[PDB]
Amino acid sequence: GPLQSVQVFGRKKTATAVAHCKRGNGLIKVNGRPLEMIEPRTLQYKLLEPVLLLGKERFAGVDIRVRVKGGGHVAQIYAIRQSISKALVAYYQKYVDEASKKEIKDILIQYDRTLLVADPRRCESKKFGGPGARARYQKSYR
Amino acid sequence: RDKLNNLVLFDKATYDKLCKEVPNYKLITPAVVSERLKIRGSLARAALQELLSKGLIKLVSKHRAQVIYTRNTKG
Amino acid sequence: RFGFPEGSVELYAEKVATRGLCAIAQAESLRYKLLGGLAVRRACYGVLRFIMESGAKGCEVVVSGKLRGQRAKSMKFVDGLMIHSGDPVNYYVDTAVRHVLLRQGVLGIKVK
Amino acid sequence: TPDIKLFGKWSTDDVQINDISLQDYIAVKEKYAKYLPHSAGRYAAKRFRKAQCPIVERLTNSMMMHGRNNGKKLMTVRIVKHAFEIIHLLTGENPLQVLVNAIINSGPREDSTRIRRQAVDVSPLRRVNQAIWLLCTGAREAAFRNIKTIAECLADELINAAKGSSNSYAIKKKDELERVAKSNR
Amino acid sequence: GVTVKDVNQQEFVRALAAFLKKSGKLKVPEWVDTVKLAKHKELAPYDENWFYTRAASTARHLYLRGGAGVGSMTKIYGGRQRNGVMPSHFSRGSKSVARRVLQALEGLKMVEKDQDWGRKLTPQGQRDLDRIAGQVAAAKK
Amino acid sequence: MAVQISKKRKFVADGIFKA
Amino acid sequence: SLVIPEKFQHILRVLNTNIDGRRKIAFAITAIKGVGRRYAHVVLRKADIDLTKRAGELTEDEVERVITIMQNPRQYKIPDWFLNRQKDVKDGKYSQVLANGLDNKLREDLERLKKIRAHRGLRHFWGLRVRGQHTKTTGRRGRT
Amino acid sequence: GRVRTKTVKKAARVIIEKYYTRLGNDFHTNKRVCEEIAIIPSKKLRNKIAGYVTHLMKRIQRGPVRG
Amino acid sequence: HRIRITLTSRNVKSLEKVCADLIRGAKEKNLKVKGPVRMPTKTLRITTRKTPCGEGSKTWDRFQMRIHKRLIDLHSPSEIVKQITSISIEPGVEVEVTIA
Amino acid sequence: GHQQLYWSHPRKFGQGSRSCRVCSNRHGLIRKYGLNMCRQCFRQYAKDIGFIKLD
RNA sequence: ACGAGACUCUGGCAUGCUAACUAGUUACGCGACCCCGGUCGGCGUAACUUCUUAGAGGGACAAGUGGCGUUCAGCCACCCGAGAUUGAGCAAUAACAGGUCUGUGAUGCCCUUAGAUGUCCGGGGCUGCACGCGCGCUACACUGACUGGCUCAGCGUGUGCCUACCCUACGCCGGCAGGCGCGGGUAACCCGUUGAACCCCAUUCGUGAUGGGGAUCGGGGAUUGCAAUUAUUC
């Protein structure tokens, strides 16, 4: 049997993360630690959205690891969320049919577009005359 | 303008009215035990780890900021 | 001064062909006509004429300073086309700004 | 499971948006009930894009006010996750049907604006906008310099407004917001 | 069949702190009563046996990242120097107090220096890390 | 070079030679 | 256990100070002018004294144990970096100085610099700032 | 915001005057026509031209246009 | 036999004029040379004040000075490196090499 | 000695030791990238040295 | 016709392409621990360029429909899609008696020019303090503060001609500051996988000018420097 390498990324901010799909059983983890204790635990269910809308039947014979670097905390949570969702679609492109690869794609677009389509909203550059972009220092008269 | 005078350890009746009437409410938070039973927030916390130990109250969800206990259910 | 060993460094001298478009060759062409004693209108219309003789698209020659009198005067000489904004004004203009010590004051030479 | 989206551990169904007047601008029924309120965002681009934002995320975003709290949404998703425990373990109803009953009673149906200021009615989105402000203000005021925490006052005001018992902050403000509007109509 | 990374990392140092009441030969220093653990702190560390918690945490930071030293322990133990009236800066931890864990975990055969400087974690210690992970991985049951 | 100046000092200090 | 014990101390009187008997004993002693939030911990750390106890709970003959460590910091095993009057001007001794003495130590210090006519002593007499502040715009409400 | 300038609208009224035969309804075909039949020194301005070309081209499918 | 070209230039497509001639100019003698490795660019960031004196609205400059680095390794005897690198240069690129 | 007294000041450090390498004034000096150049003369020769305004 | 726009750089997209022992990923032998199989920035060298890097082009146009509109210029909405208005740089004519002679070996003029407005050195001064305005930092707590643990950055900088003064891993002595030994780096090699803070979770507190605030002042220890009182800083 040949090798089935699927290495697919997700971005919500400068935080990037590539979710890797192969064959096995549904054990998903992040730099070696499973999904059930990705701190903060407040946004736990934001990581189980491509698990709980789809089930452990689409994570029946696919083992996933999510290598993460850069950015922040909530930026990573959504960059791993999007990546495992994109990697699940792009495991189903190259090795199984399109009308199942298209199916799960159509369900997660009906939940949140961010599961597949990345947000290009980034840190706007600071200007002189203010502390940031769209804010100037306090003007004095008289 | 007004200065509240809360209790630091239990008087004879404040332990009696806590040991009886804390599960006879429906919410039990250490902010309402400090409010109603006229004690301080630290005592209100310290007076509920021993009622969870007793079998009178029940924990729902724990956090560093706020814990919410309730009455032991009808079931 | 820069401490190069004796036999490494050597200078060659090349004449600029179509020297009219070279605004730093025209900022000097407008400079050393005045300090001898050619007038502010006469010299400037003629150097502007030579860079129009040179076959340039358009130009702007501004001379600012003590143009006769105790109070300062500025005479702007524009014929042909001149862009100001955008990227292309990095490689479409040659902007030369020169001083000249006339015996009454200092004049600016904005050949453009 | 793809049958229903358990809001943390709360059911999407049996949240009847009772008021026909405030139906479309209160979004939770069947599509606009996500698991955790903390969405991606992008509900500030168009004029009425913000009415598609789920009513809990609207109430989540309106809690994190007054400088020190700005950009602490994680911190006030937890305020909502703890306040929704206080609602059910008093009331005995689905906390979100009670949350929906709050805005329907809280929303000032008329206002006064300076054309003396003349009496005017509001937008059916404006009642959703102004109510979520009013009972994030009362929850913030009552628990400031107080032993009673935010989650309790946020759960009190959501219950007190849903009841319309006049000890709610949002109701008393509406009781004078619409009283001043009656004075000049 | 478990490792430390599979299990909750927050209550895993709570396991190794309860474990480092038993071994009882880290050879803890003498200043531990009075010491301020970094210059950006104000008060005493509440936990009177804190050294068994920051021996517990250092034992798994050195597991996760090998070849880490004392001045790196000052980075992973940084907080806020709340500078009174000036804006707060990122102050490190302290060299000496972190160097005493790396003569306490090195006293017991748990950590070891690697080539070109830097403390790694010895395979004997690596077992003693992974075996108490199993004790918490059944404490969840 | 022996003292070995950087490439952030190459284009700046040899840039001064153009000036 | 959680009730008030017998012979409770709502009020203490240690070293002409009213120590209110409702604080943590790590913070109860801070009223004495010379022991702060930081110092009162390490005093109660020197013996196995449970500092989860409130300011009227602890043993009535063991409040002497709290005093003698404050009066003698050195003898009860405290290093010399943890003292206020380290290397005194007169007797050159390292002593943690408490309520009544801390005034005496300050009074002798301000009157020392006053007497020798050192510039530090001058800006104390004048009611100015002494630690080299900009006195132009700030330092207002004390001086009209 | 999207109002076509005179350097867009004049390239729109000369390309159709000369090269009506080559153009069509589709943008992407007569995006590529403008590369062969014009020297446009910008990537963006070509699309600005070819965009309003197709607008005018859908109007010459109907009836008379002014310029 | 293990040689390493140091291509450090200010202008971008000036560096293309050399890093095209270090493959197309080298393969004619049949040497399996390595490819030009894109080393990351360096924006030397200066913000000065436009005003010489200190009067006006605080208007700042942003003098960026980008630098572009490439390396090409050489499977070459160093006699042939003296041939190619001493031919066809422009002042934009500083022609440097690490020896072994 | 006058030789002992005429240059007795250390120029090891401070903002009176180094100067502008065009102006020879000790203000607005770019010590960055070894320019030793006042902010005005830098602005004059920015295009000439290699620097350019883009951002 | 200049200006606006176009433009230039920058942000978002290329699972296509050229290239990546100073960026790696994947596999593999291999070391280790975990009871058939995982974890590992543990080492070692066949594919690869998805992830990082920065070149070549490309995509985006109101192009697509549904409506408004003289039915033109365009506008509103939806589909489509990474984009359906990224952010800045440049910037016309004609000006102000705007600011700068204390940026310049830019300078006309006016003085000055050995008993010096030149000049150098030590000391003081720029900070001096009844007051008035301006820009800001820290807060007035419990959405908190404390003390634990847990988990992520992105810009850049760095050993200078004169010019000394570089960024700092580590090994130790020290409560801290800090000192002393040792190797790395002129840099995608080294600091640095930049273990940043907020934040997270778990302790302590409990409405009290309090465990909020850290002003004011005393006492000691070091640092850079030829030296700190007029507290350099810590």
Q: Where are the domains of chain H?
A: 6-61
Per-residue b or e along G18-38, where b marks 16 or more CB atoms closer than 10 Å to that residue's CB? ebebbbbbbebbbbbbbbeeb
Residue E92 backbone zone (phi > 0: left; psi -120 to 50: alpha; other: beta): beta
Number of structural domains found in chain E: 1
Residue E18 CB in 7 A reach of strand K: no
Q: Which of G47, D163, I46 is nearest to J45 (CA)?
A: I46
Residue J54 CB in 7 A reach of strand K: yes
Neighbours of F13 (CB within 10 A): 16
Task: Name the residue with the least CA to C1' distance from nucleotide K52.
Answer: I40
Angle between helical axes of D95-106 and D126-143 (0-180°, round to 10): 110
Distance, CA of D93 to CA of D166 (rounded, Å): 21
Q: Which of D5, D87, D4, D1 is nearest to D39 (CA)?
A: D5
Give yes or no for a contact between E124 and E109, defined as CB atoms under 8 angstroms apart.
yes
Amino acid at the residue E123: P
Give yes or no for a contact between G110 and G124, defined as CB atoms under 8 angstroms apart.
yes
CA dihedral B39, B43, B48, B49 (to 10 degrees): 180
Distance, CA of J30 to CA of J52 (rounded, Å): 16
Distance, CA of G24 to CA of B22 (rounded, Å): 26
Task: Measure the N-to-C terminal CA separation of chain D; round to a whole number of Å.
Answer: 53
Residue of I nearest to J41 (CA): I52
Q: What angle is formed at CA I37 by the lines to CA I33 and CA I42, rounded to 5 degrees?
A: 150
Give the Å distances, CA to CA, from E38 to B65, E74, E80, G43.
25, 9, 10, 20
- With tokens 């030397």, the residue in question is I44
Distance, CA of J39 to CA of I47 (rounded, Å): 10
DSSP string, I38-71: EEEEEEEEE--BS-SSS-SS--B--EEEEEEEEE
Is A129 in Cβ contact with I47 (below 8 Å)?
A: no
Give yes or no for a contact between E110 and E20, defined as CB atoms under 8 angstroms apart.
no
Beta bridge partners of J37: J30
CATH number of G2-79: 1.10.8.50
Give the Å distances, CA to CA, from H31 to A138, B49, H11, H42, H52.
49, 75, 13, 13, 11
- Enter the resolution in angstroms: 3.1
CATH number of H6-61: 1.10.60.20
Contacts of E51 (CB under 8 A, 6+ apart): E26, E28, E29, E32, E100, E101, E104
**Which nucleotide lies at the shortest CA–C1' distance from C103?**
K108
Length of chain E: 141
Q: Which of G82, G20, G4, G86 is nearest to G55 (CA)?
A: G20
Distance, CA of B53 to CA of G8 (rounded, Å): 27
Contacts of G92 (CB under 8 A, 6+ apart): none
Q: Which residues of B touch G2 (CB under 8 A)?
A: 9-10, 15, 43, 46-47, 50
Distance, CA of J29 to CA of F2 (rounded, Å): 27
**CATH number where B27 lies:** 1.10.10.10
Alpha carbons within 13 angstroms on the beta-carbon side of residue G11 total 4
Pairing relation of β-strands A28-30 and A64-69? parallel
Per-residue b or e along C60-96, where b marks 16 or more CB atoms closer than 10 Å to that residue's CB? bbbbebebeeeeeeeeeeeeeeeeeeeeeeeeebbeb
Give the Å distances, CA to CA, from E54 to B52, E17, E94.
31, 8, 13
- With tokens 């090269």, the residue in question is H19
Q: Which of B41, G25, C58 is nearest to D146 (CA)?
A: B41
Q: Is I73 helix (H, G, I), strand (E, B) or coil?
A: strand
Give me the domains of chain D, ranges plus CATH numbers. 6-183 (1.10.455.10)
Residue B43 lies in domain: 4-73
Amino acid at the residue B63: H
Tokens of A60: 């029946």
Contacts of D149 (CB under 8 A, 6+ apart): B29, B31, B65, B66, D143
Q: Which of A44, D150, D56 is nearest to B31 (CA)?
A: D150
Pairing relation of β-strands I93-98 and I2-9? antiparallel
Q: What angle is formed at CA D120 by the lines to CA D117 and CA D121, rounded to 5 degrees?
A: 155
Contacts of H22 (CB under 8 A, 6+ apart): H30, H33, H37
Q: What angle is formed at CA C7 by the lines to CA C3 and CA C11, rounded to 5 degrees?
A: 85
Give me the domains of chain J, ranges plus CATH numbers. 3-55 (4.10.830.10)
For the purposes of burial, counting CB atoms within 10 Å of the CB of A6, is it exposed (0-12), middle (13-18) or buried (19 or more)? Answer: buried
One-letter-per-residue 3-state SS of G81-93: HHCCECCCCCCCC
Contacts of E111 (CB under 8 A, 6+ apart): E59, E62, E102, E105, E119, E120, E121, E122, E125
Distance, CA of E134 to CA of E1 (rounded, Å): 8
Give yes or no for a contact between E121 and E58, defined as CB atoms under 8 angstroms apart.
no
Distance, CA of D178 to CA of D131 (rounded, Å): 13
Q: Give the J window 4-43 contacts with F, CB below 8 Å.
A: 21, 33-35, 37
Residues of chain G with CATH 1.10.8.50: 2-79
Q: Pick J50's closest partner by Cβ from I10, I48, I62.
A: I10
Distance, CA of A84 to CA of A35 (rounded, Å): 11
Give the Å distances, CA to CA, from A6 to A21, A53, A97, A114, E44.
5, 22, 15, 20, 52
Cβ-based contacts (< 7 Å) between H 6-65 and strand K: 6-8, 25, 27-28, 31, 42-45, 47-48, 51-52, 54-56, 58-59, 62-63
Number of structural domains found in chain I: 1
Distance, CA of B71 to CA of B54 (rounded, Å): 12
- In CATH, the architecture of A1-142 is 2-Layer Sandwich (3.30)
Amino acid at the residue G127: G
Contacts of B73 (CB under 8 A, 6+ apart): B58
Q: Is H31 helix (H, G, I), strand (E, B) or coil?
A: helix
Is E43 in Cβ contact with G42 (below 8 Å)?
A: no
DSSP string, E72-110: HHHHHT---B--TTSPPB-----HHHHHTGGGTTTTTTT
Distance, CA of B50 to CA of C102 (rounded, Å): 99
Give the Å distances, CA to CA, from C1 to A93, D12, F4, G99, J18.
69, 83, 21, 73, 19
**CATH number where I59 lies:** 3.30.70.600
- Give kind and range of the element (H or E) at residue A89: helix A74-91
Tokens of J32: 């960055």
DSSP structural state of residue F8: T
Q: Pick J49's closest partner by Cβ from F5, F9, F16.
A: F16
For the purposes of burial, counting CB atoms within 10 Å of the CB of C40, is it exposed (0-12), middle (13-18) or buried (19 or more)? Answer: middle
E122 CB within 8 Å of a chain A CB: no
Give the Å distances, CA to CA, from G122 to A109, C78, G114, G129, G136.
77, 73, 6, 10, 18
Contacts of D31 (CB under 8 A, 6+ apart): A110
Tokens of B26: 């429906």
Distance, CA of A8 to CA of A84 (rounded, Å): 8
A34 CB within 8 Å of a chain E CB: yes
Residue E60 lies in domain: 1-141
Give the Å distances, CA to CA, from A79 to A11, A86, E6, G62.
5, 10, 21, 60
A32 CB within 8 Å of a chain E CB: yes
Distance, CA of D61 to CA of D41 (rounded, Å): 11
Give yes or no for a contact between B43 and B58, defined as CB atoms under 8 angstroms apart.
no
Contacts of A42 (CB under 8 A, 6+ apart): D36, D38, D74, D77, D78, D81
E strands along E1-141, which residues?
111-113, 119-121
